[PDB]
Structure 1
Amino acid sequence: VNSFSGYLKLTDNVYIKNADIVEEAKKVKPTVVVNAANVYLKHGGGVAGALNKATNNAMQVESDDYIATNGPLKVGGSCVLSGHNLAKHCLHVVGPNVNKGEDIQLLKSAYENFNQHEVLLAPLLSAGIFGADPIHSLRVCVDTVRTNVYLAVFDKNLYDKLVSSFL
């Protein structure tokens, strides 16, 4: 038993809700919140910009030190950093950005990072400003992640579409 509430159960291990991941994060204090990061950890907009704003830019300050030491992530890759006031940890995961021409097959590799964590609060990778089809992203999530994932979907309309079309 964990503290996530109001989720719809899609599979043995995948759950979905219409929620603002920032507000869900501040209420659950999950062990892991996933950020929809880019390779430079430049948290300017989308989920990343919202999450970073909620940390009063501390996420960005920590991320800039990470990049200065380690260089950029790979598309499909991840790193674990602090969750600041939102979670114990933030798993920054880079899905392919269709608006940059990145290969959508990397979406599976991106979701594989979730399997290193027993429970996660996450957005749909490569959705939103990353330009992928959120229904495809949900399918890849369900077919790739084996750990317990709680998907927060900001847009109510999108959600109702994700649920109603889920096979």
Structure 2
Amino acid sequence: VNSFSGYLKLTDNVYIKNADIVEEAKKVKPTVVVNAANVYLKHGGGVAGALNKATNNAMQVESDDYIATNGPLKVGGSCVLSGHNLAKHCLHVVGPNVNKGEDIQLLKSAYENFNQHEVLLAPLLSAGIFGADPIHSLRVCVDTVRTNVYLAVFDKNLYDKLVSSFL
């Protein structure tokens, strides 16, 4: 039993809710919140900008030190950093950004990072400003992640479409 509330169960291990991931993280304080990161960990907008703003820019400060030490992530890759006031840990995962021309096949590699964590609160990778089709992202999630994932979808209209079209 865990503390996630109001989710629709899609599969054995995937759950979905119309929610603001920032507000959901603030309430649940999950072990892991996933950030929709880019390779530079520049958290300017979308989910990343919202998560970083909620940490009062502490996420960005920590991220800048990470990059100065380690260099950029790979598209499809991830790193574990602090969850600050939102979660124990933040798993920064880089999905391909279609608006940069990145290969959508890398979306499966991106979701594989979730399998290193037993339970996660996450957004749909490569959705929103990353330019992928969220219906496709949900399909890849369900077909790739085997650990327990609670998906937060900000837009109510999109949430209803994702549920109604789910096979």
Tell me, in whole angstroms, the C-alpha distance in 2 between the residues paired with 1:55 and 1:44. Answer: 13
Instruction: Please report how far the alpha carbon of residue 75 of structure 1 lies from its aligned counterpart in structure 2 after TM superposition.
Output: 0.0
**What is the 5 A alignment of 1:91-106?**
91-106=91-106
Matched position secondary structure for 1:163: helix
Per the TM alignment, residue 3 of structure 1 is displaced from its structure 2 partner at its CA by 0.1
TM-score, normalization by structure 2: 1.00
What is the TM-score of this pair, normalised by structure 1?
A: 1.00
In structure 1, C-alpha distance between the alignment counterparts of 2:76 and 2:110, rounded to whole Å: 4
Work out the CA distance in 1 between the residues paired with 2:10 and 2:124: 14
Aligned to 2:121, the other structure's residue is in SS state strand
Sequence identity of aligned pairs in percent? 100
1:73-122 deviations in whole A, cap 9, x for unaligned? 00000000000000000000000000000000000000000000000000
Q: Give 5+ residue unaligned stretches, structure 1.
A: none
Matched, 1:144 2:144: yes
- Residues 37-89 of structure 1, C-alpha deviations (whole Å, 9 max, x = no match): 00000000000000000000000000000000000000000000000000000
CA RMSD in angstroms, aligned pairs only: 0.1
Give 1:141 deviation, angstroms.
0.1
Q: Secondary structure at the match of 2:149?
A: strand
The whole-number CA distance in structure 2 between the counterparts of 1:53 and 1:20 is 13
Q: Quick one: distance in 2 between partners of 1:94 and 1:102?
A: 11
Stretches of structure 2 lacking an aligned partner (at least 5 in a row)? none
The 5 Å alignment of 1:31-70 reads 31-70=31-70
SS of the equivalent of 2:115 reads helix
Q: State the shift of 1:153 in Å.
A: 0.1
Alignment: residue pair count: 167
Runs of 4+ aligned structure 1 residues displaced above 6 Å come to: none
